[PDB]
Amino acid sequence: GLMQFTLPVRLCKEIELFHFDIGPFENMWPGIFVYMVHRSCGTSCFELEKLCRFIMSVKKNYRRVPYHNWKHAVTVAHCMYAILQNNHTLFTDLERKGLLIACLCHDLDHRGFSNSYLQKFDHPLAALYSTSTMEQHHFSQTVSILQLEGHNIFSTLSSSEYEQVLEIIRKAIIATDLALYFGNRKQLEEMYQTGSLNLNNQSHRDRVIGLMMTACDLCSVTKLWPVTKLTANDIYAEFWAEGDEMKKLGIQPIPMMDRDKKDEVPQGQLGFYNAVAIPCYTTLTQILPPTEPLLKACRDNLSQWEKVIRGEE
Ligand SMILES: COc1c(C)cnc(CSc2nc3ccc4cccnc4c3[nH]2)c1C
Ligand SMILES: [Mg+2]
Ligand SMILES: [Zn+2]
């Protein structure tokens, strides 16, 4: 009850900044997450025995893939921590509980392959879930782990609060399907400009939470340049393996996944920042002004990719 987690001084300070990197010491990541839950939610939000057992079961159900791994889960949860901390009063007690857990679980049991690859392969998950295939799988796995004896961190919620939190986590995880991001952001853009955006409207809150999930999920583009650049190696390591497997099915992959088109990475990064990253953090900054450091970090990184193209690095 009186047991806090404490980090070393450099981590205690930098963990509050949007651009924090959680470091290469895997054994510290669970404590970093518990620290963030305690400061974000309270030391009473969860029974520490059940939370610790939830964390270690979630860790076990992430695989050894280059990018969609346990480091990504904790990284995405840290970005959500920074958003919630910088927007103290805008979120309910249930939303703060649900969203950090949602981020930790958002890519559970990822195999390193896109929804398109599962469909073209004719993978069983593609028959079970026709759209947002992996994201429906990730939520399914989250419910499974919550139902293990000793793992139900929500047990002290009432029946209706339990149903509300699972529903927050479900929409939050579905919203990390990038196919759905584009329409979600256009709607939030119209609503903000015509002035109809209303944060007491549940359907509006849902949309805003969806954008927060895209922002946290893409947060490698908001780090210091050396982190952004080294994470891009892991992202393309997964993509190029998928392209290899497309060729095995007799299908030319899109250039993003074809290792033979490495040379076009810098130009592909520009398109991604201009079409997805910048618009995402711009709309998020309009709705939640204190998230501006993410937009500023994203624009810095766009500038670094432009310098790569101009041969300056
Ligand atoms: C997970 O989201 C991402 C993040 C965070 C960073 N980078 C990316 C990759 S963006 C990207 N879009 C394209 C389009 C054509 C390409 C042709 C040749 C090489 N790379 C390409 C590329 N990379 C993604 C998808
Ligand atoms: Mg995902
Ligand atoms: Zn993810």
Three-class SS state of 20: coil
Rounded to whole angstroms, the Cα distance separating 68 from 253 reads 20
| Most distant CA pair in the chain, distance | 60
Token readout for 178 is 């990038």
Q: Is 217 annotated as a binding residue?
A: yes
Closest CA to 102 of 154, 67, 150, 149: 154
Phi, psi (degrees; rounded to nearest 5) at 156? -85, 5
Distance 41 CA to ligand 3 centre (A): 22
DSSP label at residue 131: S
The answer to whether 110 and 65 are in contact (CB under 8 A) is yes
The residues near 289 (Cβ < 8 Å, ≥ 6 apart) are none
Q: List, comma-separated, the residues after which the chain is broken, a break being a C to N distance over 2.5 A; otherwise answer none.
A: none
Rounded to whole angstroms, the Cα distance separating 253 from 26 reads 33
Closest CA to 209 of 96, 56, 41, 46: 96
Nominal resolution in Å? 2.2
Closest CA to 105 of 12, 193, 169: 169
Ligand 1, pocket-test mutation among 107, 214, 246, 265, most atoms within 8 A of CB? 265
Rounded to whole angstroms, the Cα distance separating 14 from 20 reads 6
The answer to whether 43 and 1 are in contact (CB under 8 A) is yes
Nearest C-alpha to atom 5 of ligand 1 is from which residue? Answer: 218
Closest CA to 170 of 98, 115, 69: 98
Provide the residue type at 259 as one letter: R
E-only strand ranges, 130-239: none
Q: Which of 19, 68, 78, 110 is an active site residue?
A: 68
Method: X-ray
Measured from CB, residues less than 6 Å from any atom of ligand 1 are 218, 220-221, 232, 235, 255-256, 261, 264-265, 268-269, 271-272
To 10 degrees, the CA torsion angle through 158, 160, 162, 168? Answer: -150
Cα–Cα distances in angstroms (integers) from residue 30 to residues 53, 60, 255, in the given order: 10, 12, 37
Question: Is 151 known to be catalytic?
Answer: no
The CATH superfamily holding the domain 28-310 is: 3'5'-cyclic nucleotide phosphodiesterase, catalytic domain (1.10.1300.10)
